[PDB]
Amino acid sequence: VIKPDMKIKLRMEGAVNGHPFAIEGVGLGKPFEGKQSMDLKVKEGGPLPFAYDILTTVFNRVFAKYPENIVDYFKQSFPEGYSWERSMNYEDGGICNATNDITLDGDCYIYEIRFDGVNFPANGPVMQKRTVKWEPSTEKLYVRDGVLKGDVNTALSLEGGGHYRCDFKTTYKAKKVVQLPDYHFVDHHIEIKSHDKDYSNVNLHEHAEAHSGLP
Amino acid sequence: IKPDMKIKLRMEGAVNGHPFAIEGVGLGKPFEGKQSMDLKVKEGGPLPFAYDILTTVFNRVFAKYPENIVDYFKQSFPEGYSWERSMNYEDGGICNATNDITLDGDCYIYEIRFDGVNFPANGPVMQKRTVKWEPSTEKLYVRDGVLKGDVNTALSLEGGGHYRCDFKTTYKAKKVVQLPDYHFVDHHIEIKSHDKDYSNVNLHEHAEAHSGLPMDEL
Amino acid sequence: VIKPDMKIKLRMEGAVNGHPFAIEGVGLGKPFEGKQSMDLKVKEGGPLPFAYDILTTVFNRVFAKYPENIVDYFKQSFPEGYSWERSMNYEDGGICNATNDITLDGDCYIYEIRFDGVNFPANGPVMQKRTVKWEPSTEKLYVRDGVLKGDVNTALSLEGGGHYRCDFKTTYKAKKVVQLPDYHFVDHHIEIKSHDKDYSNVNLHEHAEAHSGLPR
Amino acid sequence: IKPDMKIKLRMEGAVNGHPFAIEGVGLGKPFEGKQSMDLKVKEGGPLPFAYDILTTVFNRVFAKYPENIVDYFKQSFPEGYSWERSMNYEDGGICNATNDITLDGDCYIYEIRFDGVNFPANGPVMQKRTVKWEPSTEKLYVRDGVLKGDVNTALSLEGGGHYRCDFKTTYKAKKVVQLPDYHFVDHHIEIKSHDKDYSNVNLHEHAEAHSGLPDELY
């Protein structure tokens, strides 16, 4: 069952350029509205020496507003839940691999997240912390070999005006057999609404809505 | 830029080293973001590859831009603009294309070059197993004083599933224009009729610019 | 600081498609001959559900024969040691990210390794365990922004015949300031010499030699 | 075939939309893996891009093959072979090229097409900041009954550092020939002389096949 008001609990363990860190979060969202927010706390490896923005899209497509005409792969997967894997290939060769194992306990989603980024150059916008925010995005979702894929090419706006491109490849895997959707889209907008100076505390929001594009 | 505009084009190209040429005439409504055209294979027919790889090469002036997004393309006329594009398919087939667009009265004139390589003999392009392009959402952003366009899209396949392609486009106005912020263009391109070997093709496209997840005030 | 005969001790912690595992190894090698061998034992997450081959090039370029005329970035970095990071981008979309922090204790190199692979399709050669061996390879090494890079586009041989390609991007980072080499190459040949049925025990060998390619 | 062979080619192409044409004549020793040629720009000069992006497009028959490795290329004659290639530079510039190689007496005849797109205005190609290709080691392997070649190589830059490029080549014999095992070809290509705007270029290449890490002193 998925209620109008759900909660979120997560732990991320990870590393960037070989340097370990760990983050925990608690939050709330409205799955039928495609909106969520959460408060994140760095527990290990702080102060983080890399742009926090590379982490935020790893911190659940159940928080997406799906219209009746499009099959909802994610709300179907519960109570058993689903997992996802993702590669995030930035244009300067930095690459982040991430996984999230999502379970449900009562009215609370539980995330077990792993995050590993390598080859971020010392003078690039990530290690120099010169990212501003992710732009809004439109993810493309499609079935391949019985599971759901999501591809998007998006970008971070940089301090000073420019953009830093990143290519997302996600595989979504329900833990139980669910009915699969047709090719469709998910519009996203993720935003850090508040943070302290070294990002030990972050309030993170996301809004997402599925659609089928131009008719 | 009038409410009703005409299109005239010629494409010269090659796929896997085998040359061909296509000419087209069409019409469209630039402010409604809609256009259609009839295309004729002039050389190299019958084409031995999936026609679909050509269709997104057969003009973002035909995109409905809201007042609230700066229109790079309508600004560039009468002088016009040019674009370059690489289309990177997931099985390694790669197509490079260019279009130099000028304006003659109410008619846009395209001079197009198209070169595709490394399409495997047993793949969906050389075996014409494509059905259509899905609708897409392109991302547009400024780099080095010109406009770029990236989109990861896909062709639907004859037996199910999809065949992915990554587009990288560079748009270059021929005169100085005002650059627009990061935005999107939704597309849907469709073959609306064709004869058996695709020597004749009726092609339509609909495109609308927008700024992503924000209208519903009723 | 670099003896003709050196030993190896390592622990790898990692995950493939979200399923964690851990492996430890002990070995020995001859840095000036560019040869090494090691025994690896599955400690957690066995029996491994993926092709063991994707791990082996993560199980140290100090074990490469460098001529006098090519600066040896790796033997220079000791006793302080060096670290490396790597992406391994397979042609079907599977991606493995790995890091190795290498230290030296007496005559023993100590590796702390992390390995994370995602998006390997269920019907692909990795999850179906259809790999035979890595082919011999030639890595290209060059300086960028004060550190050393290594790129190579190798392949794994498959059972029914054919090859499964992988693009390697490695960054090597000495822990101290060392002299930087010119553009050069390292030939590799890595081989699993013995293993038990589910690869809980693996004997792994590699041979490597640096060179500067066809002369000018 | 012969220990001494001649070469005559013509390349037609475009970079970032702008068209050009080059012709060349040369000679080489296929069993020694060495060749040289003189190239002349016939159209589109002075070339506004780094000449180096063209040179590896200007024939693996000029590679020294040991007896233990099957020679796909020397087998394909007199009928010849063709190849297609995509050259993917690290800043997004991409070049697609094809070469149809035939044999006329003792002269190889190349018909070459070259199309590069998305080279940024401030990058090393459009600013002519390349020095030379480094030596390389190509990996060759059979796929789909034809021969493939992959190599990740680099151009050295005029201010230091390197500019990377990933080559993907498909080699297609025109007749049925014997297929080789996975192997390598070492390359070293060099511009030995040129005039100021590269309308005239003397180009050399040396190439040798081998099987990777294998001097018994005799």
Interface contact C68, partner A, CB < 8 A: no
Interface contact C187, partner D, CB < 8 A: yes
**Residues of chain C positioned with their CB less than 8 A from the CB of D211:** 136
State the amino acid at position A35 in one-letter form. Answer: K
Distance, CA of C85 to CA of A16 (rounded, Å): 10
Chain position carrying tokens 């990870």: A14
- Tell me whether residue D18 is annotated as binding: no
Interface contact B76, partner A, CB < 8 A: no
Cβ contact A99–C169 (<8 Å): no
Experimental method: X-ray
Residue A160 CB partners (closer than 8 Å, separation 6+) = A130
Beta bridge partners of A6: A29
Specify the pairing of strand D107-117 against strand D5-15. Answer: parallel
Write b or e for each residue in A78-103: b if 16 or more Cβ atoms lie within 10 A of its Cβ, otherwise e.
Answer: beebbbbbbbbbbbbbbbbbbbbbbb
Residue A7 has φ and ψ, to the nearest 5°, of -115, 165
User: In a mutagenesis test of the D interface, which of B49, B95, B96, B141 is the best target, namely the one with the most D β-carbons within 10 Å?
Assistant: B96
The token duo for B198 is 């695709």
Interface contact A35, partner B, CB < 8 A: no
Distance, CA of D218 to CA of D215 (rounded, Å): 7
Tally the C-alpha atoms within 13 A of residue A211's C-alpha that lie toward its C-beta.
15
Beta bridge partners of B12: B21, B113
Do residues D100 and D108 lie in contact, with contact meaning Cβ atoms separated by under 8 Å? no
Tally the C-alpha atoms within 13 A of residue C15's C-alpha that lie toward its C-beta.
18
Cβ contact D182–C212 (<8 Å): no
Residue B52 has φ and ψ, to the nearest 5°, of -55, -30
Write b or e for each residue in A1-16: b if 16 or more Cβ atoms lie within 10 A of its Cβ, otherwise e.
Answer: ebeeebbbebebbbbb
Interface contact C153, partner A, CB < 8 A: no
Q: Where are the beta strands (DSSP E) in chain D?
A: 5-15, 18-29, 34-43, 81-89, 94-104, 107-117, 130-133, 136-143, 146-157, 162-173, 183-194, 200-210
Distance, CA of C1 to CA of B99 (rounded, Å): 62
Residue B90 CB partners (closer than 8 Å, separation 6+) = B163, B164, B165
Closest CB to D208 among C135, C152, C214: C214
Distance, CA of D103 to CA of D6 (rounded, Å): 10
Chain position carrying tokens 């201010």: D159
Q: Where are the beta strands (DSSP E) in chain A?
A: 6-16, 19-30, 35-44, 82-90, 95-105, 108-118, 131-134, 137-144, 147-158, 163-174, 184-195, 201-211
The burial of C188, by beta-carbon neighbours within 10 Å (0-12 exposed, 13-18 middle, 19 or more buried), is given as buried
Interface contact A17, partner C, CB < 8 A: yes
Query: What is the SS3 assignment for C114-177?
Result: EEEEECCCCCCCCCCCCEEEECCEEEEEEEECCEEEEEEEEEEEECCCCEEEEEEEEEEEECCC
- Give the residue from C127, C156, C147 showing the smallest Cα distance to C49: C127
- Give the residue from D72, D213, D75 showing the smallest Cα distance to D140: D72
Chain A residues 122-141 within an 8 A CB cutoff of chain B = 135-138, 140
Nearest CA in chain D to B148: D118
Beta bridge partners of B29: B34
Cβ contact C151–D164 (<8 Å): yes
Residue D59 CB partners (closer than 8 Å, separation 6+) = D7, D35, D73, D99, D101, D108, D110
Cβ contact A153–B166 (<8 Å): yes
Write b or e for each residue in D61-86: b if 16 or more Cβ atoms lie within 10 A of its Cβ, otherwise e.
Answer: bbbbbeeebbbbbebbbeebbbbbbb
* Intra-chain end-to-end CA distance of chain B, in Å: 32
- Tell me whether residue B183 is annotated as binding: no
- Give the residue from A127, A100, A98, A102 showing the smallest Cα distance to A115: A98
State the amino acid at position C57 in one-letter form. Answer: T
Interface contact A97, partner B, CB < 8 A: no
Measure Cα distances from A204 to A9, A26, A37, B81, D152 in Å: 13, 10, 5, 41, 40
Interface contact A174, partner C, CB < 8 A: no
Residue A53 CB partners (closer than 8 Å, separation 6+) = A131, A132, A133, A134, A156, A192
Nearest CA in chain A to B139: A154
Chain position carrying tokens 């029996």: C47
Neighbours of chain A (3+ CB pairs under 8 A): B, C
**Residues of chain D positioned with their CB less than 8 A from the CB of B92:** 86, 168
Interface contact D153, partner C, CB < 8 A: yes
Q: How many CB pairs under 8 A join B and D?
A: 71
Domains of chain C: 1-216 (2.40.155.10)
Beta bridge partners of A18: none
State this model's resolution in angstroms: 2.1
Residue D105 CB partners (closer than 8 Å, separation 6+) = none
Residue A162 CB partners (closer than 8 Å, separation 6+) = B143
Q: CA angle at residue C51 from B118 to C206, to 5 degrees?
A: 90
**Residues of chain A positioned with their CB less than 8 A from the CB of B139:** 135, 137-138, 153-155
Cβ contact C183–D134 (<8 Å): yes
Specify the pairing of strand B146-157 against strand B183-194. Answer: unpaired
Chain position carrying tokens 């058993």: A80
Measure Cα distances from B34 to B61, B203, D85, D141 in Å: 10, 11, 36, 47
Q: CA angle at residue B79 from B75 to B85, to 5 degrees?
A: 80
Cβ contact C140–D150 (<8 Å): no
**Residues of chain A positioned with their CB less than 8 A from the CB of B143:** 162-163
Interface contact D85, partner B, CB < 8 A: yes
Specify the pairing of strand A108-118 against strand A6-16. Answer: parallel
Cβ contact D117–B85 (<8 Å): yes
Neighbours of chain B (3+ CB pairs under 8 A): A, D
Distance, CA of A158 to CA of A147 (rounded, Å): 34
Residue B164 CB partners (closer than 8 Å, separation 6+) = A151, B89, B90, B152, B153, B154
Residue C53 has φ and ψ, to the nearest 5°, of -60, -30
Measure Cα distances from A163 to B144, C211, D86 in Å: 11, 39, 27
Measure Cα distances from B214 to A135, A209, C4 in Å: 12, 11, 66
Distance, CA of C145 to CA of C176 (rounded, Å): 15
